[PDB]
Amino acid sequence: MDSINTRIAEELSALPSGRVQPQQVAAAVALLDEGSTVPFIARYRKEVTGSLDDTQLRMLEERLRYLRELEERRGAILASIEEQGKLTPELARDIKLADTKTRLEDLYLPYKQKRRTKGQIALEAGLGALADALFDDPTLVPESEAARFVDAEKGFADVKAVLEGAKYILMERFAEDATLLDKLRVFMKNEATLTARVVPGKEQEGAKFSDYFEHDEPLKSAPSHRALAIFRGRNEGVLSASLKVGEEAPGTLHPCEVMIAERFGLSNQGRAADKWLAEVVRWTWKVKLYTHLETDLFGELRDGAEDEAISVFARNLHDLLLAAPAGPRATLGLDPGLRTGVKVAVVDATGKLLDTATVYPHAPKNQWDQTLAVLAALCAKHQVELIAIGNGTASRETDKLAGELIKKYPGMKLTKIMVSEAGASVYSASELAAKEFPELDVSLRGAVSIARRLQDPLAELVKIEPKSIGVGQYQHDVSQLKLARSLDAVVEDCVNAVGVDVNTASAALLARISGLNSTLAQNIVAHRDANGAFRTRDELKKVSRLGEKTFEQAAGFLRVMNGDNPLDASAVHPETYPLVQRIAADTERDIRSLIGDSAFLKRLDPKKFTDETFGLPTVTDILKELDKPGRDPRPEFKTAEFQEGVESLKDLKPGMVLEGVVTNVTNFGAFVDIGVHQDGLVHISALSEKFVKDPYEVVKAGDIVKVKVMEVDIPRNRVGLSMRMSDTPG
Numbered sequence: 001m002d003s004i005n006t007r008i009a010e011e012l013s014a015l016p017s018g019r020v021q022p023q024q025v026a027a028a029v030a031l032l033d034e035g036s037t038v039p040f041i042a043r044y045r046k047e048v049t050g051s052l053d054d055t056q057l058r059m060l061e062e063r064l065r066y067l068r069e070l071e072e073r074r075g076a077i078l079a080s081i082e083e084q085g086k087l088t089p090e091l092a093r094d095i096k097l098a099d100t101k102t103r104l105e106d107l108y109l110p111y112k113q114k115r116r117t118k119g120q121i122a123l124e125a126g127l128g129a130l131a132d133a134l135f136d137d138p139t140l141v142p143e144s145e146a147a148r149f150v151d152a153e154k155g156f157a158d159v160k161a162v163l164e165g166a167k168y169i170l171m172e173r174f175a176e177d178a179t180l181l182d183k184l185r186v187f188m189k190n191e192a193t194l195t196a197r198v199v200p201g202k203e204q205e206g207a208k209f210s211d212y213f214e215h216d217e218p219l220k221s222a223p224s225h226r227a228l229a230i231f232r233g234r235n236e237g238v239l240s241a242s243l244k245v246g247e248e249a250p251g252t253l254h255p256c257e258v259m260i261a262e263r264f265g266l267s268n269q270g271r272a273a274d275k276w277l278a279e280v281v282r283w284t285w286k287v288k289l290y291t292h293l294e295t296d297l298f299g300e301l302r303d304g305a306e307d308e309a310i311s312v313f314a315r316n317l318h319d320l321l322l323a324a325p326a327g328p329r330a331t332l333g334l335d336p337g338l339r340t341g342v343k344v345a346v347v348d349a350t351g352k353l354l355d356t357a358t359v360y361p362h363a364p365k366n367q368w369d370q371t372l373a374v375l376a377a378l379c380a381k382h383q384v385e386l387i388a389i390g391n392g393t394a395s396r397e398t399d400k401l402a403g404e405l406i407k408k409y410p411g412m413k414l415t416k417i418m419v420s421e422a423g424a425s426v427y428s429a430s431e432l433a434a435k436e437f438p439e440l441d442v443s444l445r446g447a448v449s450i451a452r453r454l455q456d457p458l459a460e461l462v463k464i465e466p467k468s469i470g471v472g473q474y475q476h477d478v479s480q481l482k483l484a485r486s487l488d489a490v491v492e493d494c495v496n497a498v499g500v501d502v503n504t505a506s507a508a509l510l511a512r513i514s515g516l517n518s519t520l521a522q523n524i525v526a527h528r529d530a531n532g533a534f535r536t537r538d539e540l541k542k543v544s545r546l547g548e549k550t551f552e553q554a555a556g557f558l559r560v561m562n563g564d565n566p567l568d569a570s571a572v573h574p575e576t577y578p579l580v581q582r583i584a585a586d587t588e589r590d591i592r593s594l595i596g597d598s599a600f601l602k603r604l605d606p607k608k609f610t611d612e613t614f615g616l617p618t619v620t621d622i623l624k625e626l627d628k629p630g631r632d633p634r635p636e637f638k639t640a641e642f643q644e645g646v647e648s649l650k651d652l653k654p655g656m657v658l659e660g661v662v663t664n665v666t667n668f669g670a671f672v673d674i675g676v677h678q679d680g681l682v683h684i685s686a687l688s689e690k691f692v693k694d695p696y697e698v699v700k701a702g703d704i705v706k707v708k709v710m711e712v713d714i715p716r717n718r719v720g721l722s723m724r725m726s727d728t729p730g
Contacts, residue, residue, distance in 0.1 A: 004067045005029065007099075011063055012056050024050040028060055037514040038489075039496035040553050044573050046617035054493055070101055077108045084111060094178075102185070102296060109176035119172035122165030125154045130162065131169040138266075138273040142166075163276065170280050175288035180263045184256055185293055191255070192219045192243035192297070196230050199240055206238025219243060219297065224305040228477050231302060243294055257285050306478045313471035313478075314486045320469060321494035324637040325456040326417065330354075331386040332379060333451025334402070335421065335443075338362040338394035344375065345447035346382045350504070351455055353437070354382050356444045362397050371401060376409050387414055388454035390421030390446070403644060415639050417454055423461055424449035426468040432508070433463075458498055458634075463508045466491055495557075497633050499571065502540070502558045503533040515553025520546055534560055537568045559630050566591045570629035572622055579614055580622060594626045601627050649676050652712045652719055654729050660721070662703045670699045672707055672721050680721035682707060689725050 005022040008029075012020040028049045031041050038057045041049060052060070078095060081087045091107070098104045114120070122128075130149050134142055146162040156162045174180070196215035198206055206213070212230055233239025245255050261267065261281045268274045333345040344357040355378060361371035378384065387402050389395060395418070402416040427433050428445035437445050453460040461469055466487035467480075475483060495512040502510070502524065510521035520543070527543045528534065537555050540546055546554075552575065560568035572580060584591050586608070587600075594601065606619040625631075640653040652674075660672035663679050670687060671679040682705070685691075687698045699705065710729045711720035722729075 001071065004064065004071065007067060008060055008063045012052075012059060015056060015059070017053065017056060020052070020056065021050065024052060025060060028052055028057060029064060032061060032064070035549070035553075037492070037496075037553055039492060039514045039557065043496075043571070044556060044575075044618070046621075047613075047615040051617060058489055058493075070099075070104065073101065073104055074098065077104060077111075081108070081111045086111060102300075103178075103182070106181045107178050109178065109181075117172060118165065118168035121155060122169050125149075125151050125156055125165065127156070127162060127165045127169060131166040131173075134166065134273045134276065135170060135264075138269075138271040138277060141272045142276045167276070167280050167283060171284040171288055174260060174264065174281070174284045175292065177263065180260065181289070181293070183259060183263070184289060185296055187256065187259065188243060188245065188293055188297055189220055192245045193217060194219050194222050194227070194230070194301075195242045195244050197240045197242075199233070199238055203238050206233070209233060209239055212239055216244075219301070222301060222305075224308040225474075227301055227305040228309060228474070231298075231305075232477055241298070243297060253282075254285060256289070257281050260284060260289070306482065309472065309475075309478050310483055310486050313475055313483065314490050317466060317469060317471045317487055317490045318494060320420075320471075321458050321461060321491065322497070322634050323457040324635040325458070325632075326386055326454045326637050327456075329385045329455065330383050331388055331451040331454055332375065332384045333388045333447040333449070333454070334398055335390045335424070335447040335450055336392050336394040336398040338364060338397060340443060341365065342371070342394070342398060343444050343447035344378065345444060345451050346378050346384065347448065347451045347455070348382065351452050351459075353448055356440060356447065358444070361401055362394055368401070372405055372408065375401075375405055376412070379405075379409070379412050379414065384412070385414065386451075386454060387416040388419045388451045389416060390424060390450050391418050392421040392425075395421070407645065415642050417642050419450050419453050420470075421446070421450065422470040423464060423468070424453065426464045427460075430464060458494060459506070459509060462491065462495065462512060463506065499557050499559050499630055501561050502537075503528060503560065510558075513554050514557050515550045520550065533563075535563045536560055536565045537563075537574055538565075566595060566629070570625040572625050572629075576614055576618060576622060579609065579611075579619070580626075583609055583622075583626075591626070595629060596627065598627050647675055647677075649678060649712065649714060649717060649719060652676060652709055654709055654712050654720075655727075657706065657708045660705060660707050662699055662701045662705055664701055665695050665699050667695065670695055670705075672705060672723075674707065674719070674721075676719065678717060678719065680707065680709075680719040682721040682723045686722045686724050 002022065005025040008025045009020045009022040012025070028041060031045055031048065032038075036045065038054060038061060042052065042054045042057055046052075049057075074095060078087065078092065081091065081095075094107055095104070098107060122131075127149055130145055133145055134140055142163055143159050146159040146166070149162045150157060150159065151162070156165055194217050196212040196217075198209075198213035209229060209232065212226075212233075215230075217226070230239060230241055233241065246252075261278070264281075266274075266277050266281055268278050328349040330346070330348050333343075333347065335343040337343065341358050341360040342362070344355075344359060346354040346356070348354055357374060357378070359371040359374050360367045379387075387405070389398050389402055399416070399418065402414075406412075406414040406416060424446040427449045428442050433442075433445045433449075437448060440448075449460060467475060467483060471487065491512050492514070495509065496514050500509055500513055505525075507518070507521045507525045510516055510524055511518050513521070516524075523543050523545060524540070534540060537558065537560055540555065540558065541548075541551055556571055556573040559570075563569070567574075567577060567580060580591065583604070584594065587594065587604070601623050604623060606616060606623060609619045610616055638653070638655065641656045643656075646652060646656075646658075658674045660674040660680070662670050663673050664671040667684075669681055669683045671681055673679055682699075684695055687695055692698055705723055707721045707723045708727065709719060710722040713719070
């Protein structure tokens with residue numbers, strides 16, 4: 001549908017990647033409809049879409065979802081109205097032009113059915129002529145005009161009852177006026193203020209929201225977190241929320257009452273009906289419109305706060321999944337306890353568990369000396385290189401042990417690294433962990449998780465629910481459905497960016513592979529158990545229910561390392577193997593021979609190789625692959641960092657995290673002593689995450705700042721300290 005493609009194209013063009021054309025969206029949308037995945041399209045269908053990337057494609061996918069809903073509703077509305085012989089070309093036009101669901105619905109209002117409202121009854125009683133007469137002419141006397149309409153248990157037996165009826169006829173009429181609702185909703189957005197009030201009982205039970213007991217704030221500027229916090233005065237709540245335009249001052253007309261009256265030319269000029277009419281305008285507001293608009297503006301606000309919160313969560317998860325893997329190295333995992341002692345685990349370079357243990361170095365059963373020998377024994381025994389420590393309770397305690405173990409057995413060359421322990425607790429309690437380590441009690445299972453997380457964070461984090469990875473501060477306070485959908489997408493993007501070794505991959509990791517799911521993933525692990533390693537990608541076609549289409553979506557992402565085909569270890573799709581063959585032939589060289597030959601590959605002319613299907617993008621990517629096959633997109637893990645006790649400018653590496661003392665602070669920055677007998681200069685704007693007007697304000701000499709090296713320099717004998725989030729060296 002062109003209108004969707006156009007609109008989506010337009011919305012994407014607002015992304016930094018800039019202008020996107022409707023044909024690209026048309027093209028992408030077609031691929032999605034045929035069940036191609038975002039990773040696939042992004043990676044292997046660049047020529048078709050004009051090289052749309054993941055971000056554009058995920059946004060496309062989301063907008064495509066929403067815009068298809070709108071169009072669905074728009075149709076229904078049109079059909080309904082038209083069935084009621086009421087679809088004027090002017091109406092049909094405004095509906096066509098409607099771009100929000102709110103505009104759609106509030107245009108549909110006069111045609112949404114209900115029965116039996118006060119107004120509907122009054123109408124059947126013939127009170128419409130009265131309503132119209134008073135409205136049409138304010139100089140009339142209501143009671144007088146109303147007399148003729150007393151209707152004898154038609155429901156109306158008093159002039160007062162009659163005028164009640166007529167009032168409702170007008171309220172209901174007024175409260176379904178698209179133009180008025182818009183002008184009101186817009187006005188409210190700009191002027192109304194969100195009002196946070198503790199409920200009766202002055203409950204201290206709302207201590208979490210203590211900051212919102214008397215809080216007022218502009219609607220259009222309410223920040224995501226504070227809003228979402230306020231809404232948490234939800235079902236059985238300690239808070240009340242409302243929009244209030246100006247001061248609660250009786251005897252003054254609400255600005256919206258004025259807009260209502262003005263919308264219907266109801267000026268109060270002391271005429272005979274001017275008072276009843278005023279009362280009508282006021283009842284319309286307080287009984288109909290206000291609530292209608294409060295639900296709109298609250299809902300609109302809530303969504304924005306939700307979507308924004310979730311954007312942040314998804315980013316956080318993205319950075320976690322893609323943290324640098326320490327690599328295929330034997331590791332000692334330690335889960336700090338004090339309570340239940342420390343849980344040890346040893347995993348070889350492949351993540352295989354070699355041994356567990358429970359030492360008690362800490363207070364409740366002091367054994368510092370005993371533990372150190374236990375660990376040194378394990379490290380020596382299993383050639384441990386790395387020591388993974390959970391950042392949980394007694395982590396500080398534990399970290400001391402580690403650093404000391406490393407200094408006392410430098411012959412082992414140990415490096416200690418601190419790991420987030422949050423994900424591991426969820427894992428150890430999972431059913432999955434039980435299947436993996438049944439001969440282990442629960443408390444040892446977190447330690448195995450820790451050590452593995454260090455080796456490859458992606459590989460271990462994937463084993464648990466993405467939410468439980470702990471993506472943000474108060475994630476229970478957004479739509480869980482939208483959160484799940486969003487996090488799933490992040491996991492798909494990160495798994496398929498990194499790609500997966502099909503012979504070592506767990507079922508959980510395979511599940512997130514483009515085109516795969518739980519069943520397929522399980523079938524692959526089972527097949528691998530029954531038959532041994534796949535020796536080529538083409539062997540996957542033998543896995544039950546792994547069809548042609550599935551293969552197409554997955555293959556490029558499923559790697560075979562050290563098989564009979566050198567291309568199975570790369571991001572080169574099988575569909576382009578013949579193409580690669582033409583390149584081998586053309587160069588009179590072997591694929592094995594080509595790999596890593598950067599200067600030759602770079603000399604080649606890609607255009608010599610393209611065709612109708614596989615154009616420049618495909619060929620340029622294949623050549624990059626031939627150079628560095630299945631290159632890992634994640635940051636490089638460096639052992640040179642993390643190593644403490646450095647006492648020479650030489651041994652400083654740009655990108656370490658030290659703990660120095662501020663020697664001096666100046667009008668232009670601060671000088672720090674990291675213990676290399678030379679101060680680093682943390683510049684003025686390097687002092688703060690925020691803005692720095694005055695360094696003396698932010699820091700003081702003697703303060704133990706946690707600084708991070710950026711630009712070390714041996715010849716000039718200097719070290720550049722940054723002490724900031726940016727972390728972007730020269």
